[PDB]
Design a protein around this ligand. Sequence first.
Ligand code: IAC
Ligand code: IAC
Lengths: 377, 377
Amino acid sequence: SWHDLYTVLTAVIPLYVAMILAYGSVRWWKIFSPDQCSGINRFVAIFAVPLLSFHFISTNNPYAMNLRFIAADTLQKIIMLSLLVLWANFTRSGSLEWSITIFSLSTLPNTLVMGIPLLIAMYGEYSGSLMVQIVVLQCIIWYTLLLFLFEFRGAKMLIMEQFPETAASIVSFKVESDVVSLDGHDFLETDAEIGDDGKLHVTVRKSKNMPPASVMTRLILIMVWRKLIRNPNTYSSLIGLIWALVAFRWHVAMPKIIQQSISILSDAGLGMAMFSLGLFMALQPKLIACGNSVATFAMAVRFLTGPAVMAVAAIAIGLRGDLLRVAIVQAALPQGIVPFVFAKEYNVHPAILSTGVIFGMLIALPITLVYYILLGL
Amino acid sequence: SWHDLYTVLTAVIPLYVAMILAYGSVRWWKIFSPDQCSGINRFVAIFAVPLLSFHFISTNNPYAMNLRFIAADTLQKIIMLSLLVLWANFTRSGSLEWSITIFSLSTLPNTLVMGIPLLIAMYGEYSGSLMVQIVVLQCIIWYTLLLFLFEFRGAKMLIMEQFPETAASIVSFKVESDVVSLDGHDFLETDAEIGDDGKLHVTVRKSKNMPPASVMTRLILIMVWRKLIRNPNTYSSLIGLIWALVAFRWHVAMPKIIQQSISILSDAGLGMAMFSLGLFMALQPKLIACGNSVATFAMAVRFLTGPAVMAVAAIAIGLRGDLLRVAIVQAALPQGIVPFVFAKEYNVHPAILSTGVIFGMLIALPITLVYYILLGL
Ligand SMILES: O=C(O)Cc1c[nH]c2ccccc12
Ligand SMILES: O=C(O)Cc1c[nH]c2ccccc12
């Protein structure tokens, strides 16, 4: 069915035209400076992607969500998390940063930018709705889980660097509001005060024992809240969900003035997202930025373990027909950007995630097609 | 008819939402650095505006152009040019830079970004087609005339600075291809060689008498060609005109793959144009950048002499009914950006054009409405 191939090409190749246009602008024609490219990327991440996410989340009703598809996706991610946990806590080389990066590679594809257009072209509008469900679920649950993991990593590094000898005695953390996140870019000073009852209180501000679960839970919860209240995508997804709920429970259409005020900048979503992705491709001196062997490992994870674990989860749940094919092909999408972002700010295998994103993007068509043809047999 | 007012507000206010969003991003929230803002602006000028112009020019057939409307616009501009010529050549204070800036203020509104949406909202789709006709005519003829004038200014300044005593003897100019334009940013060295027949030849490369009309014509023509072959809007308008001619003579629709490859970046046209305009508003330390008195003069010219000269030209030509109203209201639009751009690279009253553009943009609604209501009586 070469007509279906041409339809998929028509739907997907505009994104690559934009991406290659940006890549040539930075490499061939040198139209943009690195800081100008960074400015375009910042505009994208702050306005174009959050507004595109708001658009997609608001235009689908949460009450018609396919619960079985959601269960299949969450089961894939739960299987990945369980395997990673038992690998990290029962292995000599088991590690937390590797757990996070493997979770991102094997479970978090690019569902917003390329996923929705591609899957709509490949299967239909219902597939677009399913992809948007995956997008909302991912931005609300799994990116927040990534935030929890990254903040735990930062807190653990700070604890091991500040008070390793007697970290167990700490009972409460008080972080001044100036400390936005525990990324590690800024140095965080710590002071310890002994209480009347012999207890220890730690205060952290801007310049081998585990404390109780409650103390770390409090610290991570407050820090995660402080980073969520400053994440454009968090507000986008929340406000979109609330608006969708109210507008599909009471059938209330948004006023045309507000709808167009949002669309004027959301219409620049796909194009600017792909343009900034091309700018990033060009800026990076490498294309396989994490080494050939480990890059091959990351590609293999993304395009086999993602689809394979999604398949086992889907047949376990009971998905069949075009729904199972949509699930698997979605799992075979190129690795998402937001996990790469978090990896970059937290400097946790950022090269692996960059290679994932860009390389998979420009080899996502052959693999995704092969998947579609193979599943069609 | 407050419903018509609300429709105009719905059509126009999204642009101001984007513009104020950029203004706040640079001033209130300080999301963008000045160089990042410059990068966004450069992306706009190179991709979003040329692609938007290509879209608009290609989607209307040149064979259905309203010749009387075109004649009215060209008559307005011819009247302005004749008055400016007789003022500059028959007055003590008559000047060339003032001629160019007054022509830009009184004749070159923002017809692409705000003009088409506004006039479509106010009158209808045919008004959008008329505005696109004005856009194509302006980018092909009047911006090229601006280029001719600016290149003549630069050439005259170089002549007066290099060889004032015996400029009359020069017979031929030879500019090395490295010299892209005579803007004045780079210093241009000149060498004079006496020929066998007693003639003088000048060569200009990168570091009170008038020569014959032929020599200056040759120099200006070659320099204008060299700047046109590097203007994104020139290629946009040309290729759009050729495609429109071929696609409306043979009814040949563009392939969907190419159409979407172009649309993915042209869809970011209005939003990114207004976003960059807001970025420019914020970056400029002033809002009335050219002084209160001269800024008032520029606003008066823009919103009275433009509309008034357009009106006299339109009744002279024979426009009547909604066509005359569309002509006048279009003449009352805020001052265009491309003339401001040329003024900036040629450093010819750039503050006047900045004030024109931005100030008129955020006072274009009251004036344009007043015009619409007054013409409706
Ligand atoms: O991160 C991605 O690339 C895909 C994605 C899924 N949900 C999102 C929400 C906001 C921005 C991007 C995404
Ligand atoms: O310059 C303006 O702001 C309006 C306009 C008319 N014709 C144009 C062609 C390309 C870019 C802008 C314009």
